[PDB]
Amino acid sequence: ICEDDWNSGERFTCTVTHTDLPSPLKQTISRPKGVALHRPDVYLLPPAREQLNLR
Amino acid sequence: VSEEEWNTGETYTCVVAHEALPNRVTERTVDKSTGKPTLYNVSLVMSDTAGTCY
Ligand SMILES: *[C@@H]1O[C@H](CO)[C@@H](O)[C@H](O)[C@H]1NC(C)=O
Ligand SMILES: *[C@@H]1O[C@H](CO)[C@@H](O)[C@H](O)[C@H]1NC(C)=O
């Protein structure tokens, strides 16, 4: 399925019908909209000169 | 002293003796290594390696 469709929160559930438990069980998978979206600020710090000096 | 003897690296000391001395005797020495130098190739290296000497 599309990434964006899942991001919309389709809440897929794999319906399972079993003899011991007549009632089908639902297990939703979706993205909670409450969580914010802040872009990472990725920083790449080179090796400390104290590492290179030790060589 | 001989000219060629001084040319090689043989050091001398002119130990003098004076009353007004702590040890009562003063020793001072020289050699060609102590003479006037000509060349000075100071390397004066500059390195980020700071803590360790050399
Ligand atoms: C000093 O001069 C000599 C030539 O007389 C040279 O071979 C040497 O590299 C010089 N020292 C330096 C550049 O540190
Ligand atoms: C300085 O000059 C001499 C040449 O008499 C040379 O052998 C020596 O390597 C030089 N110093 C350095 C740090 O290279």
Swiss-Prot record, chain A:
Lineage: superkingdom: Eukaryota
Post-translational modification: N-glycosylated; important for IgM secretion and its localization at the plasma membrane. The interaction with FCMR is glycan-independent.
Subunit composition and interactions: The basic structural unit of both sIgM and mIgM molecules consists of two identical heavy chains and two identical light chains; disulfide-linked. N-terminal variable regions of the heavy and light chains form the antigen binding sites, whereas the C-terminal constant regions of the heavy chains interact with immune receptors to mediate effector functions.
Associated disorder: Agammaglobulinemia 1, autosomal recessive: A primary immunodeficiency characterized by profoundly low or absent serum antibodies and low or absent circulating B cells due to an early block of B-cell development. Affected individuals develop severe infections in the first years of life.
Function as written in the Swiss-Prot or TrEMBL entry: Constant region of immunoglobulin heavy chains. Immunoglobulins, also known as antibodies, are membrane-bound or secreted glycoproteins produced by B lymphocytes. In the recognition phase of humoral immunity, the membrane-bound immunoglobulins serve as receptors which, upon binding of a specific antigen, trigger the clonal expansion and differentiation of B lymphocytes into immunoglobulins-secreting plasma cells. Secreted immunoglobulins mediate the effector phase of humoral immunity, which results in the elimination of bound antigens.
UniProt protein name: Immunoglobulin heavy constant mu
Species of origin: Homo sapiens (Human)
Taxonomic lineage from the root: Eukaryota, Metazoa, Chordata, Craniata, Vertebrata
Section of the entire sequence shown: 290 to 344 of 474
